[PDB]
Design a protein around this nucleic acid. Structure first.
Length: 47
RNA sequence: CCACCCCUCCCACGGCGCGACCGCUGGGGCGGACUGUCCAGUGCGCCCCGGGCGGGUCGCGCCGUCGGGCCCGGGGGGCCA
């Protein structure tokens, strides 16, 4: 009788990011700086 | 028409210090993610700037030059005029 497809109307999206963004070079380069500081004050406090 | 004496036009090229324009670019603040075996650190989206730098566009001031304009225009020597 009526095979034609009435589409579902695209509601206004508030646009929030459920996905985690890609970690930038500055952050990645700085983490390994913080880690190699954290390791050397885990010796200076220790020894 | 040119050598002589001031001034004046646009165009060309080079220099120079200035305006008005896309990038680049430390710090002040919203907003959110994120990191570190101390509370401390790092991008990020709207904007704000304290700045400088050239790229070229665009528009100036002034200087350069046996400059180009039938050597623009106005106050003795050579022209297949």
């Amino acid at each position: 009788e009526n095979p034609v497809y009435e589409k579902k109307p695209k509601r206004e999206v508030k646009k929030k990011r459920w996905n985690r963004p890609k970690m930038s070079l500055a952050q990645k380069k700085d983490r390994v700086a913080q880690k190699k500081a954290s390791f050397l004050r885990a010796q200076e406090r220790a020894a």
